[PDB]
Structures are given as structure tokens and as C-alpha cells.
Amino acid sequence: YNSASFSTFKCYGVSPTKLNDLCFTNVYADSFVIRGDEVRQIAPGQTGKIADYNYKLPDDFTGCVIAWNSNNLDSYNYLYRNLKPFERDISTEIYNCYFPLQSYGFQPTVGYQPYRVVVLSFELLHAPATVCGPKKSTNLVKNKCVNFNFNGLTGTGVLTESNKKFLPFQQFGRDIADTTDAVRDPQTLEILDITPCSFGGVSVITPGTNTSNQVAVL
Amino acid sequence: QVQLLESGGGLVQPGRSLRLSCAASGFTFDDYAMHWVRQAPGKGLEWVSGVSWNSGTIGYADSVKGRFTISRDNAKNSLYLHMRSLRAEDTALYYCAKAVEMVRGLGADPEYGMDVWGQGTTVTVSSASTKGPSVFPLAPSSKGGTAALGCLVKDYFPEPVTVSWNSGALTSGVHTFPAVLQSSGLYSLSSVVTVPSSSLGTQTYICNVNHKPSNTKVDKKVEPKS
Amino acid sequence: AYTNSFTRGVYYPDKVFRSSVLHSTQDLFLPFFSNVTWFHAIHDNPVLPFNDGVYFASTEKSNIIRGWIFGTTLDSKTQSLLIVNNATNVVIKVCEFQFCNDPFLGVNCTFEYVSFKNLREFVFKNIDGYFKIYSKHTPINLVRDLPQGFSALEPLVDLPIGINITRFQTLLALHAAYYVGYLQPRTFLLKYNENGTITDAVDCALDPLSETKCTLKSFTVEKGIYQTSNFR
Amino acid sequence: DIVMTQSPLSLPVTPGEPASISCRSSQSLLHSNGYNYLDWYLQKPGQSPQLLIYLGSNRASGVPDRFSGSGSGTDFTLKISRVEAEDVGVYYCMQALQTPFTFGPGTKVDIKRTVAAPSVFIFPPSDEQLKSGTASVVCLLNNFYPREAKVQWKVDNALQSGNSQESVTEQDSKDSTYSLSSTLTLSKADYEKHKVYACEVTHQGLSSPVTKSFNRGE
Ligand SMILES: *[C@@H]1O[C@H](CO)[C@@H](O)[C@H](O)[C@H]1NC(C)=O
Ligand SMILES: *[C@@H]1O[C@H](CO)[C@@H](O)[C@H](O)[C@H]1NC(C)=O
């Protein structure tokens, strides 16, 4: 994110700074070569010459896009062809009958120079799998009102040892609302209960100030 | 065990296309840069093309540039070579070889070391209707010691013909040379055996020619004529 | 020969624990009270459809069923999935197998994973390149049919392959019976019990009483009149 | 566009002695790493070739320790500590620096013996070449050493070219001798015109080139 030798580095759905602290289920690296600034043409939900026929994107792409120049390498060979995003249209039979593939004229023409494109498609809440950035595991403190980051799950509470008989495959448990009422801990495989830290509004009981300034607090 | 099987050979007239395919089985196909290497008939090897571990081609030979087109597929473990606008000079065997150093295992990436080789196909190109062989005699010179006599096969296409002598028994003293190629593409070769001149004027000697595609087995009784 | 699938086909859709709670979820289930296809193995293993995943129930006291071949081409063309179980090895493979009809011994490739007196029932699903297999083994003593009763269906394994499958074929050992059913997108109400195991479920899409049970969100309804849907 | 050469072009080796071969280039293959990129390859008679040495001198896997590689700059050498009966065939050196790669013409290694002289025979066209317009003459040379030998086709002192071809066989396993055979083809317009036709052989074992001639019309 700080080796800015690339051309375009735009993350959609994720801010680049906060990438170091998230355990993703999986990532998909999709790579290709396209000429010109067709980086604008390939946009989530947008249209374009390449987008409408080659490689589309969804409406909620929680991923990132990278692209840079390849003039030092590519200078006939490069070719390009209403479809669902993330598609392989390997059916390229000639269709009266015309050319299926139009060719990029590799040559030092910025105006029409080729480019390398990579797309990093994350899924971070699609599986129990864990893929995180650099971080240090710490010793968990029990029965103290603490804030916790269990491989992405960030919360605050008091972590009482639990016996909730989770089945051998469940990552974590919950209840009526979106209330993580337990968790299975990595590195120890134990069932930890979560309890809210105490709160409750105070109240002030007082006789009139024209009688006394003493006060009690409930 | 590592296997490299290629397919696509067969006679093809000049000015057409072919699509050779090499399939690999027994290793992680993505960590090895493949190569396609020709082998002329009765000549030295010659590099043709290659492909790195990221489906990025590494250039073609100087005299072939313009027509050949390599492509690779890691999902199906395959390497294809499309070939267009042939000429009569592109008849040869074709091996698909593998690199040695796995990528990022130690400066740059590796490309050398063509270690494992499949048994290549036999691509050929020509324009000639299948014709049968013509058998010719080579009588003894009738000039000491042991004199040689033989039979010569001319104007046959394609290979291979098989020549034996005395129906198969005579084996000590036979010689058969590889099929030389001619002007019009119709091949030619010969076989010769050396026998005592004393056994030249009364014995029996027959050479037997077998051509499989033309479905023939011709007999030739060779003796001096004067 | 068809069979009445009493209540089979309810598995765990989500990997998050619940407890003593009625959760209504829409998923790809096997509708209550369907006609499951029978197959007898006297003197039988044709190609079946794989439209929407498959509920495969195998009753066994001889252990001759061995696995499954999934694909569309089935002759060294595409990565046809294969499950094979022999006396020590449970191999899941996706090679392009070169043997046309029923590969086994009686009495190209991209992935590999190695691990009437019983009822082993499996469900096969394929979503977004994840092939999910949910299994369960149950002890029975009955020789005739698929029994009457309820049980959960534990989610066992997932495989990252991602290919279009339209047909599948079971396989045996050369020298039994089983049942198959297909899946439809229903909306169940599951009763997660105290330990968190599905003890009952109602299919809202079957008959009016189940529809009202699903709207009220309970398994008993008082007398009266309840507004449920809209004809249009 | 780099051209190699090898030396010697063809050498006879005898089992039980060291063998040396030199490969020379046009541009020194010293890369920035300090590694020479030359490779040494072997081909057995009638099989697919096999790898001998990669990266200049690093011995390949699975080959015995009887081979050695050395050299640098533009000159490299391969030397077998001990040669045996299973070390015959063709050797090549291949670059790996500047694409496209290249293979040397190839060194032909065979088994040596005592020098022997060829036996020479001539063969005129039969009567089947008198009713078919095509006339063929065959000169035969058998049981000679070494590989080098050459032929003139002579017709009334008027040397010809182009139309005469030749072919040779493999080395005989037992007595290690070679056989050559040349053919001359022509029409039915000049064959019945010139009188004396001769095959001339030049070889080391003969004091003078030997001329075997026949005359037309016996
Ligand atoms: C972390 O290391 C400990 C032993 O050092 C081990 O018990 C634990 O299983 C490891 N974590 C995982 C996910 O394997
Ligand atoms: C499952 O539930 C029953 C009662 O609901 C209870 O015995 C226990 O919580 C579990 N049974 C076991 C562990 O045998």
C-alpha cells in the first residue's frame, strides 16, 4: 500500500490503512493484461467496452484493484473478445461468421500502451478460515472488563469461561439479536462466555438547596 | 510417475494448420516452464518455443517467428501449440520438455534444464498421392572373394517399407540404408547382401518387400543376367 | 417403486450455535412428504440427474456401495469428481478418469483429499465453488423400507472445486438397495433444542396449518382466524 | 541471435580413457549473478535426449560422477573421467542467456578401432530402366573406417552435381564399420549418350582415390 510504483491502487469496500488487522476467509487474485487506461472501463456496476463483454464486477465488491504499466515487456499477440460477473467465456467459436478476437497492436504508441491488471477479491465473513495481516497474539485476561479482537471479531465485555457444548465444527455461538453470546477461542479451543460490562443510569436525591447542599446518589 | 504425452501428428498439405497438444501428469504443473523443441529428420535439435510459469511466452525461434502460437492451461494441465501457414521445411519430430528449477527456489527466474522428455510425434507435410513402391534389381558386378547384390526400392510414399532376404532366414551380411528423400517427395532406399561369387551362379536369392499402407508383399528373385 | 419420504432432509445451515430457540430460515431443503425414487440391486446404477444437489439415502448391511462419480462428460474430458471408499482409504478425487463404465475391482488432474441393518444418508450441494457434503449414520434393524422418524443432518465436509455438474452415478463392487430424492428451495422453522440439536422442523410451504405455524412462530396455534397470505 | 561452435566435430573414443569436448560462444554468458548459463545435453542412438549438466558445472540429478564440466567466459569444456560402452551418441551445448536459445551442431561420439579400408562396388541400371525413362546408378562402399569419406561421380571427365545423393548406415555393433551408398538419377536422353561412368572414392586408408568404372554396351 506504500510501494506506490504501481499506476492505480484503488480498494473498494475497504480502506487501505485498516488492512493489517483483518483475518479474511480467502482471497482470489485474478490477473490479466489489457491495453490503454481500460482500468476506468472495469468498474463495479459501471459499463464499458471491455466491461460489457469480458469481465464484470458485482455491486458490493469488498475487494481491491491494482494496475500498472508493462511497456518494458509487451513490445498482434494480445487479444480480446451481457454476462454475469466473474465469468470465463471460453466459448469463443466464430460467430454471419466474423472474427471473435480483436488484437491489441503492441507498440510504443500512454496513448495505447498495454497494462497489467490484478484484482484482489476478498471474502472475510464467508468461512471460518483465517488469513490475517501482521499482528501479535497476546495472553487473554479473564473475568476483567476488557476489549477483545478475536481474529476480526471486535467487541468489549467480560470473558467468563463457558461450557456451551458447541458441536465440533461451529466457530462461535449467539442468541436472539446479533449478540455474540459465546466464542470458541483459537489456540486453546475453549468455550468463552461473553457478559456485558455493567451500566445503569445514576440518579441524584436532594432536599432543596434553600435547606441544605447535602445529596445522596442512587 | 512423471509423464509427458503429445498428440497431433499426421500428414498435412502445405498451407494449412495444426494444433499439437502436450499433457503433463505427475507434478505441480504451475512451477515449471515448458518448452517445445523440434528435431529435424536425421539432424540436430532446434529450439522452437517455450512458456514460463505464469503463462508468459518467451519468444520463438528466429526462422519460425510469424506463424507459431503457443498457449498454456494450468487448470487442465495442458500446453497447446497452434501452427499456421506451413511449408515443406517444417517436417520433424516435436518434444515437449520441462524445466528443472522450481520457481523462487534459487537472481531472476529459471528457464534452463530440459530434463524430462516425452516421445515426440511425427508431423510431416507433403503434396503427393499415396503411390506404391517400384522394385529394381542390383545384380552382382560379375567382375574375387564375396560379391554383393541387392534390390532398390524407388518412388514410394509414405514410410515405412520393410525389406527382408530369403523370406527372413538370411541375416548375416544384410545391409539396409535409411530412406533418402527425392525431388518429388517420393522416397527411395535400397538393401544389399554380400554372398560368395561361387554361390552367385547356381544358388537362390530372393528379396521380399512389404509395404503396409499400400497392402503389398512383393517378391523379387535376384540373379546375374548376361 | 416409489417411497414416502416422511421427514428426512434437515441439516445445519449456519455454523453458529443456537439454544432452545425457534429459527426460521429459507434454504435448499427436501420438502416434507415427497416421493423418493427407489433402486433395487437385483440381477442397477443408471445415470441420475444432479439438478439441485441430491439427498442420497443408502440402507446397508453388506457394505457394497463404494462411492460416486460426478460430471457431465465422464470420459477423460473434464475434472469429474469421484468419491471412493475402500477398506482403509476414503479418497476424494477430481481427475479426468479414463474408464467409461463403473470403475472398480470386484471379487489432467487438479485435486485430492484423503481421510438393511444401517442407514447412511448424505446430502450433496454445490454453491459458489464449494461442494458441501452433509452426512449421518444411523443404526436400524429393518429390512424393507426407509424408516419413520426424525434426526438432524450434521454438515461434514466441503471441497473447493467449482465445476458445473448435471449428472451423477453411484457405484458398487463387481462379482442391495437405496433411495434418492432431490432438493427444492423451501423455508423451514427449526427448533434448536437445549443442547442445540434440531429436534423438529416445520415446512411453511406445505399446507395451511404449517403456514400459520410459520407465521405465528410456534408449534401450537390457538383457535381463531389468522391472516396469512395474499392471492394475486 | 547467438551462434555457437563445438570441437572436435567428431572424435572416436575407446572405452577406458578420458574424453574432452569444447563449446565456444560469441558473447560471454557471464550474467550479473556470476553464473554461466550453458547446458550440456546427451542423445543416445534411437531414444529421446537427456540432460547432462546445467548451470555451467553443477552436475545434473541422477547421472554418475564420471562427468566433469568446466570453463567460463566464451569457452566451456566437458570431460568424462572414464568412458565406457554406454557413452556413445551425440552431444549438444545450449545457451540460456539471450532468447531465443540455440543448440550447437553436435559432437558425434563413437567407439574407435583399427583403421580399415572400404570395399567398393558399382551397379548400372537394369533393363527395367530402359523402358521407363528413369536411369539410376548405384555406387556401394562397405566395411570402412572412419566416418569420413567422399565420392566423385564422373562421366567423360565431366563432373556432375546436385542430382547425385548418398546415404550411410549406423556403426556395425560387432566389427565397428560403416557403409556408404551413392545414387545418380537421370533421364533417358543423356544416359544412352555418354560411354564410361565412374565412381571415385577418397578415404584415408587408400593410397590414392580408387576409381571404379564401367562402359556402356557390352
Ligand atoms: C499454537 O501452538 C500451540 C502449541 O505451541 C498449539 O497447542 C496450538 O494448536 C497452536 N495453534 C493452532 C491453530 O494450531
Ligand atoms: C442433551 O439434552 C439433554 C436434555 O435435554 C441433557 O441430558 C443434556 O443437556 C444433553 N444430553 C447428554 C449430554 O447426554
Coordinates of N, CA, C and O in Angstrom, one line a residue, chain C residues 24-107:
Chain C
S24 N -36.3 -19.4 11.9 CA -37.0 -19.6 10.6 C -36.0 -19.2 9.5 O -35.6 -18.1 9.5
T25 N -35.6 -20.2 8.7 CA -34.6 -20.0 7.7 C -35.1 -20.5 6.3 O -35.7 -21.6 6.3
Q26 N -34.8 -19.8 5.3 CA -35.0 -20.3 3.9 C -33.8 -20.8 3.3 O -32.7 -20.2 3.4
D27 N -33.8 -22.0 2.8 CA -32.7 -22.7 2.2 C -33.1 -23.7 1.2 O -34.3 -23.8 0.8
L28 N -32.2 -24.6 0.8 CA -32.4 -25.6 -0.2 C -32.6 -26.9 0.5 O -31.6 -27.5 0.9
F29 N -33.8 -27.3 0.8 CA -34.1 -28.5 1.6 C -34.9 -29.5 0.7 O -35.1 -29.3 -0.4
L30 N -35.2 -30.6 1.3 CA -36.0 -31.6 0.7 C -37.4 -31.5 1.3 O -37.6 -31.7 2.5
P31 N -38.4 -31.1 0.5 CA -39.8 -30.9 1.0 C -40.3 -32.1 1.8 O -40.0 -33.2 1.4
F32 N -41.0 -31.8 2.8 CA -41.7 -32.9 3.6 C -42.6 -33.7 2.6 O -43.3 -33.1 1.8
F33 N -42.7 -35.0 2.9 CA -43.6 -35.9 2.2 C -43.5 -35.8 0.7 O -44.3 -35.3 -0.1
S34 N -42.3 -36.2 0.2 CA -42.1 -36.4 -1.3 C -42.1 -37.9 -1.6 O -42.1 -38.8 -0.7
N35 N -42.0 -38.1 -2.9 CA -41.9 -39.5 -3.5 C -40.4 -39.6 -3.9 O -40.0 -39.2 -4.9
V36 N -39.6 -40.3 -3.0 CA -38.3 -40.6 -3.3 C -38.2 -41.8 -4.2 O -38.9 -42.8 -4.0
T37 N -37.3 -41.8 -5.1 CA -37.1 -42.9 -6.1 C -36.4 -44.0 -5.4 O -35.4 -43.8 -4.7
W38 N -36.9 -45.2 -5.6 CA -36.2 -46.5 -5.1 C -35.3 -47.0 -6.1 O -35.4 -46.7 -7.3
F39 N -34.3 -47.7 -5.7 CA -33.4 -48.5 -6.6 C -33.1 -49.8 -5.9 O -32.6 -49.9 -4.8
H40 N -33.5 -50.9 -6.6 CA -33.1 -52.3 -6.1 C -31.9 -52.8 -6.9 O -31.9 -52.6 -8.1
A41 N -31.0 -53.5 -6.3 CA -29.8 -54.0 -6.9 C -29.9 -55.5 -7.3 O -28.9 -56.3 -7.1
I42 N -31.0 -56.0 -7.8 CA -31.2 -57.4 -8.1 C -30.9 -57.7 -9.6 O -31.3 -56.9 -10.4
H43 N -30.1 -58.7 -9.8 CA -29.8 -59.2 -11.2 C -29.2 -58.1 -12.1 O -28.7 -58.3 -13.2
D44 N -27.9 -52.5 -11.3 CA -28.8 -51.3 -11.3 C -28.1 -50.1 -10.8 O -27.9 -49.8 -9.6
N45 N -27.6 -49.2 -11.7 CA -26.9 -48.0 -11.4 C -27.0 -47.0 -12.6 O -25.9 -46.6 -13.1
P46 N -28.2 -46.6 -13.0 CA -28.2 -45.7 -14.2 C -27.8 -44.3 -13.8 O -27.5 -44.0 -12.7
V47 N -27.7 -43.5 -14.8 CA -27.3 -42.1 -14.7 C -28.5 -41.3 -14.2 O -29.5 -41.3 -14.8
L48 N -28.3 -40.6 -13.0 CA -29.4 -39.8 -12.4 C -29.1 -38.3 -12.7 O -28.0 -37.9 -13.0
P49 N -30.1 -37.5 -12.6 CA -29.9 -36.0 -12.7 C -29.3 -35.5 -11.4 O -29.5 -36.0 -10.3
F50 N -28.6 -34.3 -11.5 CA -27.9 -33.6 -10.5 C -28.4 -32.1 -10.5 O -27.6 -31.2 -10.5
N51 N -29.7 -31.9 -10.6 CA -30.3 -30.6 -10.9 C -29.9 -29.6 -9.7 O -29.4 -28.6 -9.9
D52 N -30.3 -30.0 -8.5 CA -30.2 -29.1 -7.4 C -29.6 -29.8 -6.1 O -30.1 -29.6 -5.0
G53 N -28.5 -30.5 -6.3 CA -28.0 -31.3 -5.2 C -28.8 -32.5 -5.1 O -29.8 -32.7 -5.8
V54 N -28.4 -33.4 -4.2 CA -29.1 -34.7 -4.1 C -29.1 -35.2 -2.7 O -28.0 -35.2 -2.0
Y55 N -30.2 -35.7 -2.2 CA -30.3 -36.5 -1.0 C -30.2 -37.9 -1.3 O -31.1 -38.5 -2.0
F56 N -29.1 -38.6 -0.9 CA -28.9 -40.0 -1.2 C -28.9 -40.8 0.1 O -28.1 -40.6 1.0
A57 N -29.9 -41.7 0.2 CA -30.0 -42.5 1.4 C -29.7 -43.9 1.1 O -30.3 -44.5 0.2
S58 N -28.7 -44.5 1.7 CA -28.2 -45.8 1.5 C -28.5 -46.7 2.7 O -27.9 -46.4 3.8
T59 N -29.4 -47.7 2.6 CA -29.6 -48.7 3.6 C -28.6 -49.8 3.3 O -28.5 -50.3 2.1
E60 N -27.9 -50.3 4.3 CA -26.8 -51.2 4.1 C -26.6 -52.2 5.2 O -26.7 -51.8 6.4
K61 N -26.5 -53.5 4.9 CA -26.0 -54.5 5.8 C -24.9 -55.3 5.1 O -24.4 -56.3 5.8
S62 N -24.5 -55.0 3.9 CA -23.4 -55.7 3.2 C -22.2 -54.9 2.8 O -21.2 -55.5 2.6
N63 N -22.4 -53.6 2.8 CA -21.3 -52.7 2.5 C -20.7 -52.9 1.1 O -19.5 -53.3 1.0
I64 N -21.5 -52.8 0.1 CA -21.0 -52.9 -1.3 C -21.1 -51.6 -2.0 O -20.3 -51.5 -3.0
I65 N -21.8 -50.6 -1.6 CA -21.8 -49.3 -2.1 C -20.4 -48.7 -1.9 O -19.7 -49.0 -0.9
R66 N -19.8 -48.0 -2.9 CA -18.4 -47.6 -2.7 C -18.2 -46.1 -3.0 O -17.3 -45.5 -2.4
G67 N -19.0 -45.5 -3.8 CA -18.8 -44.0 -4.0 C -19.6 -43.4 -5.0 O -20.8 -43.8 -5.2
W68 N -19.1 -42.4 -5.7 CA -19.9 -41.6 -6.6 C -19.0 -41.0 -7.7 O -17.8 -40.7 -7.4
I69 N -19.5 -40.8 -8.8 CA -18.9 -40.1 -10.0 C -19.8 -39.0 -10.4 O -20.9 -39.2 -10.8
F70 N -19.3 -37.8 -10.3 CA -20.0 -36.6 -10.7 C -19.3 -35.9 -11.9 O -18.1 -35.8 -12.0
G71 N -20.2 -35.5 -12.8 CA -19.6 -34.8 -14.0 C -20.7 -34.6 -15.1 O -21.9 -34.8 -14.8
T72 N -20.2 -34.3 -16.3 CA -21.1 -34.1 -17.4 C -20.6 -34.8 -18.6 O -21.4 -35.2 -19.5
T73 N -19.3 -35.0 -18.7 CA -18.6 -35.6 -19.9 C -18.2 -37.1 -19.6 O -18.6 -37.9 -20.4
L74 N -17.6 -37.3 -18.5 CA -17.4 -38.7 -18.0 C -16.4 -39.6 -18.8 O -16.5 -40.8 -18.7
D75 N -15.6 -39.0 -19.7 CA -14.5 -39.8 -20.3 C -13.3 -38.9 -20.6 O -13.2 -38.4 -21.7
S76 N -12.5 -38.8 -19.6 CA -11.2 -38.0 -19.6 C -11.4 -36.7 -20.4 O -10.6 -36.4 -21.3
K77 N -12.4 -36.0 -20.0 CA -12.6 -34.7 -20.7 C -12.5 -33.5 -19.7 O -11.8 -32.6 -19.9
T78 N -13.3 -33.6 -18.6 CA -13.3 -32.5 -17.6 C -13.1 -33.2 -16.2 O -13.1 -34.4 -16.0
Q79 N -12.8 -32.3 -15.2 CA -12.5 -32.8 -13.8 C -13.7 -33.3 -13.2 O -14.4 -32.7 -12.4
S80 N -14.0 -34.6 -13.5 CA -15.2 -35.3 -12.9 C -14.9 -35.7 -11.5 O -13.9 -36.5 -11.3
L81 N -15.7 -35.3 -10.5 CA -15.4 -35.6 -9.1 C -15.7 -37.1 -8.9 O -16.5 -37.7 -9.6
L82 N -15.0 -37.6 -7.9 CA -15.1 -39.1 -7.6 C -14.9 -39.2 -6.1 O -14.0 -38.7 -5.5
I83 N -15.8 -40.0 -5.4 CA -15.6 -40.4 -4.1 C -15.5 -42.0 -4.1 O -16.4 -42.7 -4.6
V84 N -14.4 -42.5 -3.5 CA -14.2 -43.9 -3.4 C -13.9 -44.3 -1.9 O -13.0 -43.6 -1.3
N85 N -14.5 -45.3 -1.4 CA -14.3 -45.8 0.0 C -14.0 -47.3 -0.1 O -14.8 -48.1 -0.4
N86 N -12.7 -47.6 0.2 CA -12.3 -49.0 0.4 C -11.8 -49.2 1.8 O -11.6 -48.2 2.6
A87 N -11.4 -50.4 2.1 CA -11.3 -50.9 3.5 C -10.4 -50.0 4.4 O -10.5 -50.1 5.6
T88 N -9.6 -49.2 3.8 CA -8.8 -48.2 4.5 C -8.9 -46.8 4.0 O -8.6 -45.9 4.8
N89 N -9.2 -46.6 2.7 CA -9.0 -45.3 2.1 C -10.3 -44.7 1.7 O -11.1 -45.3 1.0
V90 N -10.5 -43.4 2.1 CA -11.6 -42.6 1.6 C -11.1 -41.5 0.8 O -10.7 -40.4 1.3
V91 N -11.0 -41.7 -0.5 CA -10.3 -40.8 -1.4 C -11.4 -39.9 -2.2 O -12.3 -40.5 -2.8
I92 N -11.2 -38.6 -2.2 CA -12.0 -37.7 -3.0 C -11.0 -37.2 -4.0 O -10.0 -36.6 -3.7
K93 N -11.4 -37.3 -5.3 CA -10.5 -37.0 -6.4 C -11.3 -36.3 -7.5 O -12.5 -36.3 -7.5
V94 N -10.6 -35.5 -8.3 CA -11.2 -34.8 -9.4 C -10.5 -35.1 -10.7 O -10.5 -34.2 -11.6
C95 N -9.8 -36.2 -10.9 CA -9.1 -36.5 -12.1 C -10.0 -36.7 -13.3 O -11.2 -36.7 -13.1
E96 N -9.4 -36.7 -14.5 CA -10.2 -37.0 -15.7 C -10.0 -38.5 -16.0 O -9.2 -38.9 -16.8
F97 N -10.9 -39.3 -15.3 CA -10.7 -40.7 -15.2 C -11.0 -41.4 -16.6 O -12.0 -41.1 -17.2
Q98 N -10.1 -42.3 -17.0 CA -10.2 -43.0 -18.2 C -10.7 -44.4 -17.9 O -9.9 -45.4 -18.0
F99 N -12.0 -44.5 -17.6 CA -12.6 -45.8 -17.6 C -14.1 -45.5 -17.7 O -14.7 -44.9 -16.8
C100 N -14.8 -46.0 -18.8 CA -16.1 -45.4 -19.1 C -17.2 -45.8 -18.1 O -17.9 -44.9 -17.6
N101 N -17.3 -47.0 -17.8 CA -18.5 -47.5 -17.0 C -18.1 -48.2 -15.8 O -17.5 -49.3 -15.8
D102 N -18.4 -47.6 -14.6 CA -18.2 -48.3 -13.3 C -16.8 -48.7 -13.0 O -16.5 -49.9 -13.0
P103 N -15.9 -47.8 -12.7 CA -14.5 -48.1 -12.4 C -14.4 -48.7 -11.0 O -14.5 -47.9 -10.0
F104 N -14.1 -50.0 -10.9 CA -13.7 -50.6 -9.6 C -13.3 -52.0 -9.9 O -13.4 -52.5 -11.0
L105 N -12.8 -52.7 -8.9 CA -12.4 -54.1 -8.9 C -13.3 -54.9 -8.0 O -13.4 -54.5 -6.8
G106 N -13.9 -55.9 -8.5 CA -14.8 -56.7 -7.6 C -14.1 -57.7 -6.8 O -13.2 -57.5 -6.1
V107 N -14.7 -59.0 -6.9 CA -14.0 -60.1 -6.1 C -13.8 -61.3 -7.1 O -12.7 -61.6 -7.5

